[PDB]
Symmetry: D2
Subunit: 400 residues, 4 copies
């Protein structure tokens, strides 16, 4: 192993479904943070960029045929730069970062961009080919979210629980009450409201231009509900019926966004005049039962911390993706961290900010690093649950 440094990092705002980014093609959306990294670091010879690594969970729409390569071409990067796209659903953007990290760490590259994109607004319909002449069985399925082309052997053995059903399964199996879930969701809105007002998100964001009438600029996260009250949350009806616990209020949404980071060896930092902001420590993955996918981060974090020989206490910032309050609380309880820890999602998370699957994992690493710089903390841990039962964890350390 040699050392690997995260240098510059930017993200787009995150839009609501059908919202402020809904007119931006996924490939063009993935380009925006790449173009911004080129314009923010003008001292770099971009023909020395070894690879662009992007996470993308869909890849059926405008993000088809390796959107990493589509996006780097659209962003103005030299045609000599290769690109590759990663799919670990919800954790694709974190996976891109770990994958760029491992490539640099064993000496195969010097300089890379890793991040992620999802346009859930523009997710297309898919239709299976007829497998016989004049086939009457064709159907179209929405790829915004959820299962399509269901394998009967998968449904039989593992189920096809929608994500909110998995979050109810976690609330049942780990005993996470409606009240604790709603209190977690309120803290995410409150912390994100304070961060919004302080300009913490504006420090992360690069704006998107919508060419419409006249050009407009998207600059603000659209998903947050900073006026949320505990009383409003307690009135919401659960997604899966009156005795369940998961609601639209204690869960993230469907969203659009992109993010990208520079990773570099020590030599690349010195050749290209980069600011090394953090060292990557490592990434680990784990499988769990698909029906309780939200608990994924517990064995992923434990595999990483065992190999790094570190306790959860060694971390000043923990970014635990808030796909659902039920699974966030259950992961914190298993790992021995207080429900309301100020070290965990200190500026709020996905319940406030939304969850464009491919982008989210890149956002978590980006914002952990950002919060370490503001707080003068040392170690950061980013972790998230993954559809069909996985977790992923990635640790960093601020450069002193």
């Amino acid at each position: 192993s040699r050392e690997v440094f995260i240098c510059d990092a930017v993200r787009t705002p995150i839009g609501r479904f059908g919202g402020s980014l809904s007119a931006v093609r996924a490939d063009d959306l993935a380009a925006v943070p790449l173009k911004a990294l080129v314009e923010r670091n003008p001292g770099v010879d971009w023909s020395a960029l070894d690879e662009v690594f992007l996470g993308c969970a869909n890849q059926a729409g405008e993000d088809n045929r390796n959107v990493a390569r589509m996006a780097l071409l659209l962003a103005g990067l030299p045609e000599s730069v290769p690109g590759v796209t990663l799919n670990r659903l919800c954790a694709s953007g974190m996976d891109a970062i770990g994958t760029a990290f491992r490539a640099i760490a064993c000496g195969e590259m010097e300089l890379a961009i890793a991040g992620g994109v999802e346009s859930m607004s523009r997710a297309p319909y898919v239709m299976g080919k007829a497998d016989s002449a004049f086939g009457r069985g064709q159907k179209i399925e929405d790829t915004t979210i959820g299962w399509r082309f269901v394998n009967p052997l998968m449904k039989e053995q593992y189920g096809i629980d929608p994500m909110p059903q998995t979050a109810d399964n976690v609330a049942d199996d780990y005993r996470v009450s409606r009240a604790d879930q709603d209190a977690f969701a309120l803290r995410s809105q409150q912390r994100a409201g304070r961060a919004q007002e302080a300009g913490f998100f504006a420090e992360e964001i690069v704006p998107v231009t919508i060419r419409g009438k006249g050009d407009t600029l998207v600059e603000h996260d659209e998903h947050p509900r900073p006026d949320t009250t505990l009383e409003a949350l307690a009135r919401l009806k659960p997604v899966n019926g009156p005795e369940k616990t998961v609601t639209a209020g204690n869960a993230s949404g469907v969203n659009d966004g992109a993010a990208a980071l520079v990773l570099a060896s020590a030599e690349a930092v010195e050749k290209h005049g980069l600011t090394p902001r953090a060292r990557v420590l490592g990434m680990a993955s784990a499988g769990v039962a698909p029906r309780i996918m939200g608990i994924g981060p517990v064995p992923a974090v434990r595999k990483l911390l065992r190999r790094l020989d570190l306790a959860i206490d060694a971390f000043d910032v923990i970014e635990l993706n808030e796909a659902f309050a039920s699974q966030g609380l259950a992961c914190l309880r298993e790992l021995g961290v207080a429900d309301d820890s100020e070290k965990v999602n200190p500026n709020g998370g996905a319940i406030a900010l939304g969850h464009p699957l491919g982008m989210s994992g890149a956002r978590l690493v980006l914002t952990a690093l950002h919060q370490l710089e503001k707080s003068g903390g040392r170690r950061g841990l980013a972790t998230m649950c993954v559809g069909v039962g996985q977790g992923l964890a990635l640790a960093i350390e601020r450069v002193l």
Copy 2:
């Protein structure tokens, strides 16, 4: 050094479009080699498997939402095993192996499976959402091959040349005659027919069970062993009578899957594995989309500069045969004879077909197979990528 070894490696047969594997869902197809590797190596505690890495170029069909994880669950691997899917179009399967290699090389994992899948038979149609109430503008597009949801900025700047058009561009720009392309295609069919008859492909292949009573698919379906130079010389070019690329000097559209075991020294010792090769390294390069077939040249050169090796250092070169034109253009730029017996000794994709995600993994698997049969040392696997890339991966047989 911190060595990474390729152990067991297997592949399905390769099916024609609408052919012998066309009834097998992409996810079930991917699961076939994973289940074969489990059954062939029962001394392994499979709960110690760190990751499944699969290449897949499409991911809109039965391969959606991370086919690596779908396939490992369908194959019977424990749910504790994570999976991730890579997309570098044509080279996805080679990228999977290189990615597993890097994860083990830097100490993050011990034991991985890497491979690839493509069901081009069962690739779906895609339809964009309406952006307006009562939208009249919707259309469906085929994802079997080629461009869909064309970005007009991509089309203006780099073009949207179909793969056979790029191959014609390489023929013109690198002066590769029709006659040279057709002779290359004939050698592929002849080398392939010999290897078939010798039972070489059968040693790589694990059979696919098709449920009707039940049948077994065991034989590669794409090869045309009775091909003649006169039969190739008579075909009309895809892009008109001036041009050189035909259906005969080109790969087709195909279905298949492959998977390899990769392991640290420690994992080999712990799980009683047979190490067969050491992975030396992988490199990628970009080129102009319009001549994507030349991608292997700067990828090979990047890898060989880092390893400190000349192209003559390799006993086997597996160069994907997407198009005879780009195969020859690459061989001539690299200083290797058109007809070299070191290059694709048992034939390539013109004969065997090209299920995108699978091909990269097949090239590594079969390079290692050929090294064992010949007593050679170093193998080089390389291939072009749609939208202008190349990938190269080098291996070395163990002593």
Copy 3:
């Protein structure tokens, strides 16, 4: 042949594409005039209704599988009442009336409803089946307007000219200027604006209930009563600057339904109906598809030859205004002045819109309405048809004596 009477007649307002009626399923929309006739004539034993005949040009969407029978059931008519749907594209609604007329005229039934419906807003996409395992050639086609599933034998022999191109072919071959087309369009907008202001259309219309709180849709959405000659003269032609057909001298894409009661002398007496007109007859004709707009000329001639009437025996002529070019070319062939006050006296489809299946029912309904207002005797309704047809239907107001 016995006499056949038109009794009560009603229509929905006509909506724009994606406008005021765009949320109403085609079948529900067809039910609205049927239900209005039942509630307006509560005297009648509706179990004696012999048939519902509706026109509909599309029948792929919510109007699939015989919208006449769907609509009569949704309207609350007894399940004992049968229904049949007619498709002569643009003239389907007129054909429904003429078909009811003929059934009653040769004694096969006593009492019918005839009308038409179109929801061009909600027209679906269609997709051919794959003719081979793993077929790669599938596509989807919009059914809102225009050609789909094109037969190469039809394209080669007759062409697949879009409707506005056929209107440009009629303007070229019959020499109809841009300026005469624009002046014909202006007259339709002015005439319809006077008719709107007087409450003439409100008398035709029954409201559509939109479920949200519920709203009512009560007035035509398509008219542009502030239209000026200057504003029409500025519009760019559909098929390029050397052509004449525009958005302003042509009808639109529209939603609407209409229905009329038809009865024998015996049904009028038995059910206590008010007879308002007798049907004199219907005739159809084919022309070249490329000049479909001239269809009404041989249709009107064939009808008037059999009825032994000249064109000036008609107090009202409702000529569908699909395009000003073909309206003018038709009036000039029949010897009727471009600006006649007998022709479309309350304006036409350039103002009101053209929901294909409904328009033909609307023309007969509004011809009869105009006869009652003016004290006129005979009306003629005639319209052009896609792929080269014309249809013409003549009525005579029932006159009292002493």
Copy 4:
């Protein structure tokens, strides 16, 4: 009401779903009987044809935008000849004949062609527009058979029972046993088998030629019959709607492709054009019933026609009762007072053997009733059929002496 004659009449063979006619566009298929009427009757000035009327149940596919006019143009008929398409689902082709009849009977025209077409093989999929930006609710529906774009009000008030369910409802409410349904099915296959061997269908049929790189196929024979059907093979089939029900694939018609067309003429037109008058049309009547028991539709349609003509059912030498399902065939015969096994009912078999291309079937019933009257020397024929969403239609004819 003056007299109206049926003159020449022809049909394609009936193909199976995805079978012998499956490569023929619906509009080209409809053109084949029209082209054959022209070639068989060169004594006609075809510029005097007043109208082509075709039945068609679907009209979403290659049959879109008035297939009557598309087909007469493809058939080579002059562009001066108008056409109109009727939709009464299963009865559309009978409706076309009645409609041509009524136009001639009240003096509005002299010479017409009437018939029907269905290509159930090539029926397309239909997809509703999204009613909102980025709508997630779109779906496609097969239009081969069955409900699409279901109205929740129709489902709540009347149901959306598929056709076989309606036939099970008729078997339950009218007490029609599985045994009687299978014996009815067997008689249809045996009668169609004898008619086939006798060349009876060959006299009705004009061939379709299909081209391609494997050469020409001449399609000449009905493909749906299973003349080797046995009672024990019928009795082994599993019912469509579960073990308690009676309707099977063996005691029901299928999904099929075909076209048919008939010449109708006034006395004067018969004279002027050198036509052979074969039958007088007596009349047509329609009736509604509950959609859930649509198979009983022919009972009130027949009773209404026979009341107005002042005829008893026994005045007919031939009854062509469409065999959509044996259950409704038998229920209708028992209501009209005609024996289950009558030799006057479907003497040459019916839709259980021959198939049911919706728009075409009603035209075939009238065509083949007239044919059987000519072979037998019978005087009066009755054609009747049930209709999806609860109708019947009945049409009566009289052989010219």
